[PDB]
């Protein structure tokens, strides 16, 4: 028994790619077949399964509606058609056979790499607690996540707020996208009366984001 995956490689976000799983020494229509992926340096994640002869399909929540597992018995081959590819789909994709107790035979895996495209950031609040747990000084900020390429710039209150601001250098995440945070310290007594808005400009994607940062209950 041998399982051999092909078709992995470079792919554009939003693009499509189809993997094949070539089986030998057994007819795969008589077995549940699975796709399991492994992001670089991370753990195993089950992706999809196909049932024997009934061809019933099951999908993990992260890929359903984008991925489709199928099989062609005449070629003794299993397929994973992946469609709305995104940064989180970079992984080694294994097909494996379910026999008796669990997944007993595995292929060697096929690597899929989703490369980067121009993309404006998502900007989430770093919200101050209405209750100061730091003796009267509150920390707030904006988390600027998943943009490409550099750079972004951040201002607070359209330039009105400069004292106590720290906009960090961006970090390169594993997915190839950048992320940074910008923070400011203010008096807690100001949380009820002063509006704090971060303005993020990302010229490569022609995007600007304004985020009002409000205290959490």
């Amino acid at each position: 028994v041998q399982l051999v995956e092909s078709g992995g490689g470079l792919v554009q976000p939003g693009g499509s790619l189809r993997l094949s799983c070539a089986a030998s020494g057994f007819n795969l229509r008589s077995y549940y077949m699975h796709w399991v992926r492994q992001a670089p340096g991370k753990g195993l994640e089950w992706v999809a399964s196909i049932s024997p002869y009934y061809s019933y399909t099951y999908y993990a929540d992260s890929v359903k509606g984008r991925f489709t597992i199928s099989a062609d018995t005449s070629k003794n081959t299993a397929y994973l058609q992946m469609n709305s590819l995104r940064a989180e789909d970079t992984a080694v994709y294994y097909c494996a056979r379910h026999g008796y107790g669990a997944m007993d035979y595995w292929g060697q895996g096929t690597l899929v790499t989703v490369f980067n495209q121009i993309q404006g950031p998502s900007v989430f609040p770093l919200a101050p607690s209405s209750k100061s747990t730091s003796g009267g000084t509150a920390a707030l900020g904006c988390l600027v996540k998943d943009y490409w390429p550099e750079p972004v710039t951040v201002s607070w209150n359209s330039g009105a707020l400069t004292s106590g601001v720290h906009t960090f250098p961006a970090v390169l995440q594993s997915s190839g996208l950048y992320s940074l945070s910008s923070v400011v310290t203010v008096p807690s007594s100001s949380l009820g009366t002063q509006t704090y808005i971060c303005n993020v400009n990302h010229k490569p994607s022609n995007t600007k984001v304004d985020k009002k940062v409000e205290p959490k209950s």
Binding site: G43, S51, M103
Partner: protein
């Protein structure tokens, strides 16, 4: 269905008894399997249905379940047991995996063998110079590698890489690469790589053109 593996990693000596725990949320079923994954390889099945040992797997591996906990035991840890171990739960065609447990072998300290490689003549005709420092077959992994050029400490122009633990002697190897312009390489003389571990530092060096 959710599986929670503990610990995320551990270090134990050869011959030690090791126990990986995996906690299901809704599992009245024995459908829990254990796999072993070595670097760059697909996982291998060890235990299935929580306690059946798969064919060819050594006898020191066994599985059990206590309540909502499923447990994998390696009764006498062997060096070739360096791996990441995964519990798996199989449902009405739905599968979930634990986050895994990395098992590293504790061995006796081994000082590294330190080599230093000048840039090759071939590479310099493209205008860049990489100096490579090799730490071979050492333990533990923790080490501090610094570069000096004409006795000046370098910052921001080197990158490290480390192998996974060796399946036979349980050591690591590590590379540190200094990257410089041809011009900077050609104007300085003494290149050294300093390897510090504990109370001992070893410096391997060369003089350009010698």
């Amino acid at each position: 269905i959710q599986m929670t593996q503990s610990p995320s990693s551990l270090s134990a000596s050869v011959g030690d008894r090791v126990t990986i725990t995996c906690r299901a949320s809704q599992s009245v079923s024995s459908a829990v399997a254990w796999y072993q994954q070595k670097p760059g390889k697909a996982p291998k099945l060890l235990i299935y249905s929580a306690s059946s040992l798969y064919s060819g797997v050594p006898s020191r591996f066994s599985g059990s379940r206590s309540g909502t906990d499923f447990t994998l035991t390696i009764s006498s840890l062997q060096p070739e047991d360096f791996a990441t171990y995964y519990c798996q739960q199989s449902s009405y065609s739905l599968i979930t995996f634990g986050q895994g447990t990395k098992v590293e072998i504790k061995r006796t300290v081994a000082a590294p063998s330190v080599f230093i490689f000048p840039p090759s003549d071939e590479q310099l005709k493209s205008g860049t110079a990489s100096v490579v420092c090799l730490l071979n077959n050492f333990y533990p992994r923790e080490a501090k590698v610094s570069w000096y050029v004409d006795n000046a400490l370098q910052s921001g122009n080197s990158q490290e890489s480390v192998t996974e633990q060796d399946s036979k002697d349980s050591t690591y190897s590590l590379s540190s690469t200094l990257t410089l312009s041809k011009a900077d390489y050609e104007k300085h003389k003494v290149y050294a790589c300093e390897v510090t571990q504990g109370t001992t530092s070893v410096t391997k060096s060369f003089n350009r053109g010698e």
